[PDB]
Amino acid sequence: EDFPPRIVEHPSDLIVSKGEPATLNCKAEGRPTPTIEWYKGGERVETDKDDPRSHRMLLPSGSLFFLRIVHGRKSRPDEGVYVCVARNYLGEAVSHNASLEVAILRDDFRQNPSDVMVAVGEPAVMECQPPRGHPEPTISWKKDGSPLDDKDERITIRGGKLMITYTRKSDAGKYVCVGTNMVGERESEVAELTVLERPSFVKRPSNLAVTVDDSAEFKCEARGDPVPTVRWRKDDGELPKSRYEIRDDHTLKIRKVTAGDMGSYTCVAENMVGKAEASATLTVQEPPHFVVKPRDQVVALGRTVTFQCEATGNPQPAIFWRREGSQNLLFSYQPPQSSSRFSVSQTGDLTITNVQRSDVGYYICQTLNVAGSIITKAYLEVTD
């Protein structure tokens, strides 16, 4: 008794790389043994059973076996879908079609990741598209040759993008996009991420007051990435010809300081990412000068006298009074100890009210600051 031929096992679709071996899944039974015929949509295919010189092999189990896939620029007949057919003494059989496409992966990337230059805390985005390949390559990233993961909340690898919400100095490095499939791995062109820092001050110039022909030093020190260029400037005008120097540490030194050196001097730290400035004032000290000097006076007993004494100077000088041959100092802001008939105004004058005979004498006005001291006096004569 003879049974009609029919396909028992159906072959499934599979992809194989160039040169790599591939095997199908075809099986049929009948009486006598059915010969499995392989044809690429009508066209005949060479096998080991038909000719002993052919490269393509034919297994007696039923499934077709290939050693090396024929593909190139001149000849490529191996690629294409094939269906096995069984034939016995009586009856015909046809199996389901299975895809037998050759797998490939190109050399150059459709989109190479680009270099990014950002300041600390600013986001960083890198984009990539792997080379043309079947099956379509899946993206992954590498930082300094080491694989990168989504684990860190700041880094998200979705689609063809690598995202960093805010950068840390630790984010700097050489980034490479990687395209992988069954064929292999493809690394992209190096995309370097540089995390820069704006300039800021390590030391800020401080306010200074000096006397004429002294020296003035203003200190400055900055940080940053790239290392900044520290430069001095005088705001009202220029730095003094033949009289200044900037030391290696960035100190500003003005020798033999004159009145025309009084003002604001700025220190400027600059790099590619930004600029930062810090100012400080120079106060040139001047000794005091009498504006109004007291005049000798004659006053009737019981009446009020006022000896005027006003002084200019930088800084504004302290004025005080005292009677010749006495230690009791009379100030404006201070309550007068001995008598309340004596008082110094906010501007320096000395008012004596209800003058008595013991008030006779010299009243000394003294003005002083850090740059000098000046002293003057006027006589009080008390008459009947």
Numbering used by the authors: 64 to 447
Q: What do the authors report?
A:
Roundabout (Robo) receptors provide an essential repulsive cue in neuronal development following Slit ligand binding. The Drosophila and vertebrate Robo1-3 are most similar, containing five immunoglobulin (Ig) and three fibronectin (Fn) domains in their extracellular region. Here we present the crystal structure of Robo1 Ig1-4 and Robo1 Ig5, together with a negative stain electron microscopy reconstruction of the Robo1 ectodomain.
The Robo1 Ig1-4 domains are arranged in an extended conformation, ∼170 Å in length, with essentially no polypeptide linker between any of the four domains. We obtained similar Robo1 Ig1-4 crystals in a different crystallization condition with a c axis ∼10 Å longer. Although these diffracted to a higher resolution, the Ig1 domain was disordered. Otherwise the structures are identical, apart from the βC-βD loop region of Ig4, which is better resolved in the higher-resolution dataset. Nevertheless, four crystallographic contact interfaces are observed.
